[PDB]
Design a binder for these strands. Structure first.
Lengths: 793, 125, 820, 213, 39
RNA sequence: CAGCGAAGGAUUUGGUGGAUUACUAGCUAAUAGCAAUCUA
């Protein structure tokens, strides 16, 4: 239950730093703020590393074995991570701002540009155990006079070519015996040298500067001593070079400027292969694939990330995120994608597994305040500060409906019908609730009776009663449908922000400004029970303010709460860097999550070092409708916290004779039901999978009819989280058919137990199985046409 | 100099101010004891903030209530509201928060009108 | 015994052990290299930061260590190791079996004295290299010439000579010619220390009776004598900043300061270190500086500074006494209890037999701080009792930290040796708290716990009674009386709903906590010594008296595992943070790891000291053990955080031993099965034209499969290559004169989807065929070969409606069951 | 065995509190006399409409029950009896007089039938409420009645109404008062004696429904 | 932008062939996403 | 007054030291030198 771990970070495909590819360039590693995201672009998936720098990261490299990563932040706190185990190996503090870090091509050394010293360390093994000091220093060279801007290793890991703000570039041999081969310095640029590369044969050296000159250096005679043979110029007048890279094998120089324009050249002849623009913001990063076919560009101001193949002129992806400006989120009615309403005025529909945005919608001319799904993922409603609620078909991607009032107000929250006839929206300057029909477009009603700004709205999903709650310290329940026009006001102790509604519509949980979460019975309007949450809230100290984090009244309350789908838990977040979840029977804190440890954000540290910034805040929390997770719209992105059953041995009434050995003996002796319930009492995912695949098709329905009723949600949620990605489609559908036929009355009379295990199953039937069935159906009908009709002339 | 706490209990036009502080255990309404609060059939309406949580909460604190306005039943409802939320506020400020919200849970399970009145009315249908 | 889960990382909390440290000087800064058992540690003397720790543990204890500029020379059992930045550069094996026990380094020479009164000289090869490396000669101090060698020094400007300080004599060797130049007269008492003065050719000798001699090593006389009666002299140091002071260090822990110019005694720092641990073991002035670094055997390293004089004209006669400056320290006795302060594995609380509670940092050793015992004020205003001469609290039996409400109120609850109340502490303030919870039955505190709401603390007395106090306000809330003998374990649920107590009468009581009922009581077969509650999985483990570990869950109150194998009393145990393993340690000098899923012993370590405490980190990072000897905390890292270990039992289905199940490729040949690959490949193939608008071997294998009537290699190549390659191979298939390549592709797809594997890909390959050149198939429809190939493709493909009505049933009934 | 200590000093207050008043902190009884536990509703379909599961100290809960439809199904049935007792033009508003005569009638119910008077009045409700009735199917006013069933809230409503107005007319000009006539009515309705106005009226309504069923 | 960035609490940030069209919706490989009534 | 109460108790304040981010050493013209010195 409560054992959530940080899974993913949706939104924000790039923040600051350098993009890296893999060696077999399938994944790309992107520095999001202090995490690192890794997007696998072929196997369409994505993860974010769990570890966390304390400032924004500025350098990334992983060796070409793929086996370990090193990430340096913007004051030199390096972190060495095991890339396969996903666990951090060492924390090493270089003392000043490191501009670049690079592993050697042979993997065994890495070097980095810390200030004006090039320092080469040698890589610790991944097979060795963790030591107190795993890095052993090779050397530290100081020949530059100002800060080094770039490294480049040679093809053999033998020379290293560094570029500085000082107007030179230098070549250093790795070992001392080749010191005479590499002792030259390369002058002649008017500005900062942005890059210095070898050719494929390491005979020519190209040095690209900030003003726009690329110099070709050759070991010629005018003795032989590294002349400059040709200077080529970009002649981009106002713009200047922001990032350079070179693929030496395909002779491809890729250059991004401070105007969004990037050009890519075939270098020793200097012929413009292509020139095109990311946008208007500067191109902060260029990176290239190992085969040189993909170019990943990152612009840091809008947080955007291209990877673009330059042969077939086409963008593998275009993915722009939102730093700090995200007002709301909503899970799709199957937990496959999250819709994000963001303050720059747009809707963005992010896939969860593959961490990318599918569609974006810009028809609001101001900050979109709320999104909400309806009609089972077919329609999606959003309300913004420009005065409009509007509806979005997620099939034809059209804004088909726009609802305004008559009073020119700005809407801050909405709520739709279950049977989506009516949308409803509340403002923070009008004290009314606006009730629109969705079929026609008209303003059906204006509900009046709050004496304070309507902070939150929610329709009960079962009996369709409206619950609004406002800053006049009052939650209010409106019976709209069918001749009632009934109003029931429940007073509460302080002013309310974030009401939420149970999945059965029985109760409503409100968050108040005191710091509490009160839970009320709707039909008999009396309080069922409250949680006192203002003492398990982490409220950090800002830098500008002159009052301690203990005595602050800034963020000791929750501005967004949400029920779990079994109705038993509440996740909650606010303008603080803790999100807390509770179980509402016992009113006790299950777990508290620190949403950021970035010291670049403001409200993170409670105690500031006695030796504006974007504050940290969560603006919306939601539980996943299909699989045991929650998304939180922080300032860093959409933090996705999820459990997984691979770890955490948590049995269910095992005894001493219940053992993996006992389970495989019962499987080998083919008591299949006993093996299945032994694996359920182990609650071990590999054992459940092993027994599940070992049961034959002949006796799926006998086992599925004899499964005990306490192990029913376990086998249903297992079949869901297995069958989304497993290939055994007919096996999983046979099991689903046998379970629904044998015990599908228990499910119907215990709806909210199997409310997230059944939504995960019909995330498998309509999303892989129905697509396959559509393909075979179209093949059958094209066959019947192509052989049944007359093609003659 | 003493840890003290002041709360208010209201029904229609009665209003009761309750001062709770640390002491020996005496509960006094309008100077007279609590066992004199007429109309004597609603003396248990006055008593139920004591009997719902036990007298061992009141064994270390002394309450005094001053009740003006209203009528007989509005004054006993003001008294019981003032006593209840005064005990809650004292255990908030000077005893632990766990006993604070245990008291809030007990009073709210009996009736939350011990703690929150029904105040602004009517409804214009 | 080497392990396969945990590997040794460091032993934290150690600063010194009373080997005389060495000082070294890089440039104008100073470092201080102190021995901690078998490693040394380099400290930055301007701030006492830990720069370096030696990379490997030496095979025995380091016994004499010196430091020139970049290099540190550490002598242990037989040999001298030359270390730079911790990493060992060289190892000089001596040709003896005698233990090397002194050394000096001057010039190209390293001179190492053994304990059989032989001296080994080692020489550089060429005077430009970094350390002395080659053997040169051997010197011997026989019984005629002098006693046991008590020090080995080189006083300056002495061209390749060596002052050897024996117990009675002072010899002077020429170490190039191997000669004994000068042997002094005897000394009437045994000399223990020597230090060269910054005066030219003067050494200072310290005797076992109380006198400092100032021997002039060229005249052969003694210049002066300083008498400190009944004090054995253990250190000598000289001030070199224009103030001629000497600092002697006395093995009753005293540091006495003398003016040599005006022959007075400046000041005495009394009890600067403990006499019982050696007194002041090495004291030295950082040269040119008024700061002196002392170190003692009580695991402590201090600095004292001389402020400038307070008289503005006299100065030299008004010498302000030395004051204290920075210091580092740890426990002076081996720790008795261990806990982790937080889930981040950053701080760990640690209590020792020297009656101190330290908070040690696993990230940066400067952050280690002693929790203060300065009591608060009484709550009413009365007086607090106790002695006026303040001493530390009795040594800590148990503790329990739960930082849910941290900074808010009291946070740690701790139980001391043979006293009837449990103190509280605040980890945020790093100090004691206002409350001491009594047991109320005149019994000593045998266990403590506290809930994870942070509101409640639980005391378990030796007369069998659990008392539940509030941590905020410090008063008794409840009191359960079930046991009659001593309660050794209390814990509570993560939801404050069921508590579990275990006493050494061998009954585990299960109580409801909100209601004050008991849910049950289970009688085991031995007295229980220790409980550990794994709180997420609700499984608690008991160390019974019959040397078993009983793992029992609190939900259904059954013994669910029973782990046998320990040979003596189980000292400690702890759960893995995922709750899969349990690591125990017992008085048979062993540490075992048990996989309680399978119920067997994964790994065992025979460790020479008995491990008295074992704690996992609250993440899966580290194991922390605590042994009988050694003032620190031994730290291990689990290698199973980076690899996966086999849960296969030691003594003295490889996927099921490695907890995996690689899902088999297809379960039955009559079952449809998708590809082992991404699900999106079907959609990419079906719509890659519009996707991009929004953004040969094949022919030879096809022909060879048409010969052999087996297209398995063709279909393997098709399932292998990429969507652009698939479209570009299907789009070029010779659709013109006899139509062979089309019909070979069609009955290849027939042979493919007869096999019920990759069938969504075979379906999209047929869709791509009909899309690319289904117009030529429609054109020469009624052609015999292509019509028969499509006929048998439909013959196999018409058995695909099993999937259709299967997903129709699942969709319709799932919708009906969910909604209605 | 096992015992919990949860008070650690005998609680004494400076204001002296009566011994039965401080005995009332272990169980809530109506008027500190009549226990609410082991008071069951011996007829199902009326449990969840006669409410005896939150015990009270007096029949003067001033809560608001007339602003949602079935909210008066959880007013305690002693207070519903009290509120139905204070109705006619003479005795409107006089809830303290109604509470006082409810206290008197429960005292004399117990002194006549030595059993729990809350159990007696709950049995009287569940025996009085008619289980069938007739509506007048109109046809423009064709005088024909059709038997309908009757919902449990209407059964509790009409039960309290029949009992209270039977006590009024039985006390109309006899020597007995409303408290004594209501006691006789509740006792006879509890045992179901067919000597009460209330269950004679129930038997007439049910018999007419059986007739023109 | 500038008047509502100073009238707020929380922080608000601020030829070749193509500007790559980084922001673009409608794409789960949809081509004819029009309505049948629209056609 | 009672009570608390070990060769005393309370309040206030100045200075210094250690933490307030996760520990790979100083200098320079830096593949090495110096650190007693870079200069003939």
């Amino acid at each position: 239950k409560s054992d959530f771990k940080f899974s993913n970070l949706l939104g924000t495909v790039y923040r600051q730093g350098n993009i890296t590819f893999s060696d077999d360039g399938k994944q790309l590693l992107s520095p999001v703020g202090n995490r690192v995201s890794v997007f696998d672009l072929i196997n369409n998936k994505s993860f974010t590393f769990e570890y966390e720098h304390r400032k924004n990261i500025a350098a990334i490299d992983l060796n070409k074995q793929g086996t370990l990563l090193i990430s340096i932040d913007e004051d030199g706190r390096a972190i060495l991570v095991n890339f396969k185990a996903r666990n951090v190996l060492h924390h090493f503090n270089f003392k000043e701002k490191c501009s670049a870090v690079k592993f050697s091509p042979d993997g065994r050394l890495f070097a980095l540009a810390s200030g004006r010293f090039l320092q080469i360390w040698k890589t610790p093994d991944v097979n060795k155990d963790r030591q107190f000091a795993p890095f052993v220093r090779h050397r530290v060279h100081a020949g530059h006079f100002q800060d080094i801007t770039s490294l480049t290793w040679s093809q053999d890991s033998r020379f290293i070519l560094t570029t500085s703000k000082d107007l030179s570039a230098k070549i250093w041999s790795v070992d001392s015996e080749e010191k005479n081969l590499a002792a030259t310095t390369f002058n002649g640029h008017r500005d900062y040298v942005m890059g210095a590369f070898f050719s494929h044969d390491q005979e020519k050296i190209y040095t690209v500067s900030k003003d726009g000159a690329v110099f070709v250096w050759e070991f010629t005679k005018r003795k032989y001593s590294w002349r400059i043979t040709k200077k080529h110029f970009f002649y981009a007048n106002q713009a200047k070079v922001k990032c350079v890279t070179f693929h030496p094998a395909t002779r491809l120089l890729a250059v991004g400027f401070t105007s969004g324009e990037f050009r890519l050249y075939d270098l020793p002849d200097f012929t413009l292969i292509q020139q095109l623009s990311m946008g208007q913001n500067p191109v902060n990063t260029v990176s290239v694939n190992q085969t040189g076919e993909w170019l990943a560009f990152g612009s840091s101001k809008l947080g955007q990330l291209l990877v673009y193949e330059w042969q077939s002129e086409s963008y593998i992806l275009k993915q722009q995120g939102h730093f700090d400006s995200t007002n709301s989120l909503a899970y799709s009615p199957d937990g496959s994608r999250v819709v994000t309403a963001s303050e720059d005025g747009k809707i963005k529909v992010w896939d969860i597994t593959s961490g990318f945005c599918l569609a974006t919608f810009e028809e609001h001319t101001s900050s979109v305040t709320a999104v909400q799904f309806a009609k089972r993922g077919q329609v999606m409603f959003s309300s913004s500060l420009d005065g409009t609620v509007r509806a979005w078909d997620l099939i034809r991607y059209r804004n088909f409906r726009t609802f305004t009032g008559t009073e020119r107000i700005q809407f801050n929250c909405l709520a739709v019908d279950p049977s989506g006839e009516v949308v409803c929206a509340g403002s923070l300057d009008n004290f009314d609730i606006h009730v629109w029909s969705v079929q026609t477009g008209q303003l059906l009603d204006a509900l009046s009776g709050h004496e304070g700004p309507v902070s939150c709205l929610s329709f009960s999903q079962e009996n369709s009663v409206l619950a609004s709650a406002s800053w006049d310290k009052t939650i209010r329940i409106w019976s709209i449908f069918g001749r009632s026009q009934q109003v029931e006001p429940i007073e509460v102790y302080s002013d309310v922000l974030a009401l939420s509604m149970r999945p059965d519509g029985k109760e409503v949980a409100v968050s108040t400004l005191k710091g509490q979460i009160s839970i009320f019975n709707i039909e008999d309007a009396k309080q069922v029970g409250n949680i006192d949450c203002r003492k398990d809230i982490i409220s950090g100290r800002f830098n500008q303010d002159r009052f301690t984090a203990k005595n602050s009244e800034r963020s000791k309350f929750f501005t967004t709460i949400h029920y779990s789908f079994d109705g038993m838990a509440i996740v909650a977040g606010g303008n603080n860097n803790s999100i807390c979840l509770y179980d509402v029977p016992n009113e006790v804190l299950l777990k508290r999550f620190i949403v950021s440890r970035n010291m670049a954000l403001n409200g993170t540290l409670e105690f500031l070092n006695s030796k504006m910034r974007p504050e940290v805040r969560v603006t919306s929390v939601q539980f996943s409708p299909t699989a045991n997770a929650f998304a939180a719209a922080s300032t860093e992105g959409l933090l996705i916290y999820s459990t997984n059953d691979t770890i955490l041995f948590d049995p269910f009434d095992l005894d001493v004779d219940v053992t993996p050995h006992s389970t495989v003996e019962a499987l080998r002796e083919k008591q299949f039901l006993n093996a299945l319930v032994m694996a359920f009492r182990l609650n071990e995912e590999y054992l459940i999978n092993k027994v599940y695949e070992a049961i034959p098709i002949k006796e799926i329905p006998l086992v599925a009819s004899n499964i005990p009723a306490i192990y029913l949600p376990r086998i249903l949620k297992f079949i869901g989280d297995f069958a989304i990605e497993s290939q055994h489609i007919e096996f999983n559908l046979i099991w689903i058919k046998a379970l629904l036929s044998a015990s599908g009355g228990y499910i119907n009379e215990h709806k909210y137990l199997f409310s997230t295990a059944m939504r995960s199953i019909q995330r498998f039937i309509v999303r892989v199985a129905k697509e396959v069935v559509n393909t075979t159906t179209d093949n059958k009908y094209t066959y019947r046409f192509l052989v049944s009709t007359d093609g003659s002339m | 100099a003493v840890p003290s706490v002041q709360t208010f209990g209201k029904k229609k036009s009665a209003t009761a101010v309750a001062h709770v502080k640390a002491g020996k255990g005496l509960i006094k309404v309008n100077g007279s004891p609590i066992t004199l609060v007429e109309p004597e059939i609603l003396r248990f309406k006055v008593y139920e903030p004591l009997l719902l949580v036990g007298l061992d909460k009141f064994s270390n604190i002394d309450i005094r209530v001053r009740v003006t306005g209203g009528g007989h039943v509005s004054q006993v409802y003001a008294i019981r509201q003032a006593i209840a939320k005064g005990l809650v506020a004292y255990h908030q400020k000077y005893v632990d928060e766990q006993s604070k919200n245990e008291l809030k849970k007990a009073f709210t399970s009996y009736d939350r009108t011990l703690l929150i009145a029904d105040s602004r009315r009517p409804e214009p249908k | 015994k080497n392990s396969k889960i945990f590997s040794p990382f460091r032993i934290i909390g150690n600063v010194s052990n009373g080997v005389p440290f060495a000082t070294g000087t890089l440039g104008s800064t100073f470092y201080i290299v102190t021995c901690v058992g078998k490693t040394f540690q380099i400290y930055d003397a301007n701030t006492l930061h830990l720069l370096f720790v030696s990379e490997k543990e030496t095979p025995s204890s380091i016994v004499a260590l010196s430091a020139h500029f970049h290099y540190v020379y550490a002598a242990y059992e037989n040999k001298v190791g030359i270390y730079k930045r911790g990493i060992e550069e060289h190892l000089l094996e001596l040709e003896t079996d005698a233990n090397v026990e002194h050394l000096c380094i001057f010039g190209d020479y390293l001179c190492a004295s053994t304990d059989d009164n032989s001296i080994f000289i080692y020489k550089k090869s060429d005077p430009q290299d970094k350390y002395p490396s080659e053997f040169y000669t051997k010197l011997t101090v026989t019984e005629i010439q002098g006693g046991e060698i008590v020090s080995l020094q080189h006083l300056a400007t002495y061209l390749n000579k060596l002052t050897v300080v024996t117990k009675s004599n002072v010899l002077l060797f020429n170490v190039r010619t191997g000669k004994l130049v000068f042997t002094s007269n005897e000394f009437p008492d045994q000399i223990t220390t020597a230090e060269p003065a910054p005066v030219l050719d003067i050494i200072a000798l310290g005797t076992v009776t109380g006198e400092v001699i100032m021997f002039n090593m060229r005249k052969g006389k003694r210049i002066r004598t300083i008498k400190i009666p009944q004090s054995r002299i253990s250190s000598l140091s000289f001030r070199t900043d224009g103030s001629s002071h000497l600092s002697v260090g006395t093995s009753s822990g005293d540091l006495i300061f003398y003016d040599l110019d005006r022959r007075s005694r400046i000041h005495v720092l009394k009890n600067i270190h403990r006499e019982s641990y050696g007194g002041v073991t090495q004291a030295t002035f950082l040269n040119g500086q008024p700061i002196i670094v002392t170190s003692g055997g009580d695991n402590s390293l201090k600095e004292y500074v001389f402020d400038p004089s307070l008289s503005q004209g006299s100065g030299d006669v008004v010498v302000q006494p030395p004051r204290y400056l920075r210091s580092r320290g740890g426990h002076s006795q081996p720790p008795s209890y261990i806990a982790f302060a937080d889930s981040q594995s950053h701080f760990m609380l640690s209590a020792s037999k020297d009656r101190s509670l330290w908070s040690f940092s696993l990230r940066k050793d400067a952050q280690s701080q002693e929790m203060s015992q300065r009591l608060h004020k009484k709550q009413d205003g009365g007086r607090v009792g106790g002695s006026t001469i303040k001493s530390k609290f009795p040594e800590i039996v148990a503790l329990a930290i739960e930082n849910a409400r941290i900074g808010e109120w009291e946070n740690i609850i701790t139980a001391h040796k043979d006293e009837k109340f449990a103190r509280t502490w605040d980890m945020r303030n790093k100090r004691v708290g206002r409350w001491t919870f009594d047991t109320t039955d005149d019994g000593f505190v045998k266990s403590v716990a506290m809930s994870q709401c942070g509101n409640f603390g639980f005391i378990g007395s030796s007369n069998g009674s659990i008392t539940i106090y509030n941590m905020q306000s410090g008063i008794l809330r409840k009191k359960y009386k079930l046991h009659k003998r001593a309660v050794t374990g209390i814990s509570l649920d993560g939801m404050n709903r069921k508590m579990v107590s275990c006493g050494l009468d061998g009954i585990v009581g299960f109580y409801d906590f909100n209601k004050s009922t008991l849910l049950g009581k289970l009688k085991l077969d031995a007295p229980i010594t220790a409980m550990v509650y794994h709180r997420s999985s609700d499984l608690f483990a008991l160390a019974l008296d019959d040397l078993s570990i009983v793992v029992i869950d609190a939900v259904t109150q059954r013994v669910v595992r029973q782990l046998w194998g320990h040979s003596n009393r189980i000292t400690a145990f702890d759960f893995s943070p995922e709750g899969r393993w349990i690591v125990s340690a017992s008085l048979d000098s062993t540490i075992r790891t048990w996989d309680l899923p399978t119920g067997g012993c994964i790994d065992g370590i025979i460790v020479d000291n008995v491990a008295t405490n074992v704690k996992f980190s609250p993440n899966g990072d580290l194991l922390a053990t605590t042994h009988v000897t050694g003032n620190g905390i031994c730290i291990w890292t689990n290698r199973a955080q980076f690899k996966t270990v086999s849960t296969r039992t030691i003594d003295e289905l490889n996927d099921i031993d490695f907890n995996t199940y690689t899902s088999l490729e297809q379960i039955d040949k009559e079952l449809l099965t998708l590809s082992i690959g991404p699900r999106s490949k079907m959609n990419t193939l079906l719509h890659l034209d519009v996707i991009r608008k929004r953004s040969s071997h094949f022919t030879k294998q096809l022909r060879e499969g048409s010969q052999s009537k087996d297209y398995s290699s063709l279909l393997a190549t098709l399932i292998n290559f990429s969507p652009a390659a698939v479209d570009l191979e299907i789009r070029s298939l010779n659709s013109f004169e006899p139509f062979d390549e089309i019909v070979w592709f069609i009955d290849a797809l027939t042979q493919g989807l007869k096999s019920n594997k990759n069938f969504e890909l075979y379906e999209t390959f047929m869709s791509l065929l009909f899309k690319a050149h289904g117009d030529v198939i429609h054109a020469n429809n009624k052609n015999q070969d292509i019509a028969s190939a499509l006929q048998n493709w439909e013959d196999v493909h018409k058995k695909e409606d099993r999937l259709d009505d299967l997903v129709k049933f699942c969709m319709g009934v799932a919708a009906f069951v969910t909604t209605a | 065995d096992f015992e919990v200590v949860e008070e650690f000093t005998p609680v004494v207050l400076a204001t002296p509190i009566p011994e039965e008043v401080q005995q009332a902190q272990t169980e809530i009884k109506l008027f500190n006399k009549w226990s609410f536990e082991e008071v069951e509703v011996k007829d199902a379909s009326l449990v969840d409409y006669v409410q005896v599961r939150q015990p009270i100290f007096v029949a003067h809960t001033a809560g608001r029950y007339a602003n949602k439809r079935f909210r008066k199904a959880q007013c305690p049935i002693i207070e519903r009896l009290t509120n139905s007792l204070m109705m006619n033009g003479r005795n409107n508003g006089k809830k303290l007089k109604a509470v006082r005569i409810i206290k008197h009638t429960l005292d004399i119910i117990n002194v006549l039938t030595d059993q729990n008077p809350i159990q007696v009045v709950v049995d009287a409700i569940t025996n009085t409420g008619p289980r069938e009735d007739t509506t007048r199917v109109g046809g423009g006013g064709a005088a024909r009645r059709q038997a309908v069933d009757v919902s449990p809230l209407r059964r509790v409503n009409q039960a309290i109404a029949l009992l209270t107005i039977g006590a009024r007319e039985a006390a109309f000009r006899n020597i007995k008062t409303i408290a004594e006539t209501l006691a006789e009515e509740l006792i006879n309705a509890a045992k179901g004696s067919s000597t009460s106005y209330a269950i004679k009226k129930k038997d007439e309504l049910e018999r007419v429904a059986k007739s023109n069923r | 932008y500038k008047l509502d960035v100073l009238s707020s609490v929380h922080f608000v940030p601020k030829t070749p062939t193509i500007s790559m069209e980084d922001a673009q919706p409608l794409y789960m490989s949809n081509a004819s996403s029009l309505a049948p009534q629209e056609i």
